Design a binder for these strands. Sequence first.
RNA 1: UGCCCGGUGCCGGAAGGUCAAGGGGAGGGGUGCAAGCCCCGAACCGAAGCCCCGGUGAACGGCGGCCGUAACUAUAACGGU
Length: 60
Amino acid sequence: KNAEKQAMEDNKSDIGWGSQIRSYVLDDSRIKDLRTGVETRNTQAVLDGSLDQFIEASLK
RNA sequence: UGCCCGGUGCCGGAAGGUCAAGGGGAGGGGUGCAAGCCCCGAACCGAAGCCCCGGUGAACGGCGGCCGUAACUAUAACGGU
Ligand SMILES: [Mg+2]
Ligand SMILES: [Mg+2]
Ligand SMILES: [Mg+2]
Ligand SMILES: [Mg+2]
Ligand SMILES: [Mg+2]
Ligand SMILES: [Mg+2]
Ligand SMILES: [Mg+2]
Ligand SMILES: [Mg+2]
Ligand SMILES: [Mg+2]
Ligand SMILES: [Mg+2]
Ligand SMILES: [Mg+2]
Ligand SMILES: [Mg+2]
Ligand SMILES: [Mg+2]
Ligand SMILES: [Mg+2]
Ligand SMILES: [Mg+2]
Ligand SMILES: [Mg+2]
Ligand SMILES: [Mg+2]
Ligand SMILES: [Mg+2]
Ligand SMILES: [Mg+2]
Ligand SMILES: [Mg+2]
Ligand SMILES: [Mg+2]
């Protein structure tokens, strides 16, 4: 079980520079999902929970 | 060649507590007609030892447990008890 866990951990990104999926450039009000990829402009509405947008389009 | 002198040992301590014989003799008893004779007997004085106060490990010896915590993981330098 631990062996399968370490397989996950070492295959689990790094939370680092250039390892990412979103911009919250709140200095020009975008939140971009670089993967499908959409561009909502109503930023502090995403933090409210409008994730449906990205999710529904990211399930392709 | 570390840390622990609380227990044991040894060392030191004219205080204090306890402490035997002995000293003392408040008081009581037996007997005698009596002087007397004889027997218990409190306070208090009275050593070492022990208690008590310290020291001492190349003296006898003894040198822990639980819980949480770091780059998604393991561990825990760190903390709590
Ligand atoms: Mg607001
Ligand atoms: Mg000792
Ligand atoms: Mg000792
Ligand atoms: Mg000590
Ligand atoms: Mg012994
Ligand atoms: Mg002595
Ligand atoms: Mg004195
Ligand atoms: Mg004395
Ligand atoms: Mg006497
Ligand atoms: Mg006497
Ligand atoms: Mg006498
Ligand atoms: Mg008398
Ligand atoms: Mg009589
Ligand atoms: Mg008489
Ligand atoms: Mg003495
Ligand atoms: Mg030693
Ligand atoms: Mg020595
Ligand atoms: Mg011992
Ligand atoms: Mg020894
Ligand atoms: Mg952790
Ligand atoms: Mg973690």
